């Protein structure tokens, strides 16, 4: 119960302007309303606190990617829903987006950045698998290799996430997604 209150506090700070700088245990303890010592009765380290948030990110994105794969069979619609998912999740979770973009993690154990890299790999292989099923489902492929397209799509998303963070959350990740989608669809459909 107190464990999730610490995670909630960390996310609130990440979401505010505080997230643009180191989030100290002194500051976190204060935001929570306890002593630093109290903090360390629920988590052994700051890194484990960040891992709590990364777990929510991983489960949120991967569970929904699986749902999309299972509920929607059209290839292009699958792609549109996965891209929309990553963009909208970031928009709905600005503070967690600082973690996704890597900026908030610069202050912490490097193993956390490795963890985010692993998440992006799981997402990128997902897009690859979705793209590769088109040939059997529709008897058609793409004008470029599926590996290149998946990288380009995730890269576009990573760019939106970085822009969101850079701009102190002014440049919303989902802005003009329809226009982007219409152009992308025209390129690969």
């Amino acid at each position: 119960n107190r464990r999730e209150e610490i995670l909630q506090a960390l996310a609130e700070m990440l979401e505010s302007n505080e997230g643009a700088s180191r989030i100290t245990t002194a500051k976190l303890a204060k935001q929570v309303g306890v002593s630093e010592a109290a903090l360390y009765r629920h988590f052994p380290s700051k890194t484990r606190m960040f891992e709590g948030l990364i777990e929510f990110i991983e489960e949120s994105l991967m569970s929904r990617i699986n749902r999309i794969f299972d509920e929607e069979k059209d290839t292009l619609n699958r792609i549109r829903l996965v891209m929309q998912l990553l963009l909208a999740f970031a928009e709905r979770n600005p503070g967690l987006t600082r973690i996704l973009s890597g900026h908030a993690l610069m202050f912490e154990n490097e193993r956390l950045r490795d963890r985010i890299n692993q998440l992006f790999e799981r997402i990128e292989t997902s897009l690859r698998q979705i793209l590769r099923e088109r040939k059997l489902r529709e008897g058609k492929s793409f004008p470029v290799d599926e590996n290149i397209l998946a990288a380009q799509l995730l890269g576009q998303v990573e760019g939106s996430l970085n822009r969101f963070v850079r701009s102190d959350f002014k440049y919303l990740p989902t802005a003009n997604f329809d226009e982007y989608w219409a152009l992308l669809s025209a390129q690969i459909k």
């Binding site: 909630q8 996310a11 609130e12 948030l53 929510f56 999309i68 998912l85 999740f89 709905r92 979770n93």
Partner: peptide, 8 residues
């Protein structure tokens, strides 16, 4: 799909 917001 309903996107989850971590901040309750």
């Amino acid at each position: 799909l309903d996107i989850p917001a971590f901040l309750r």
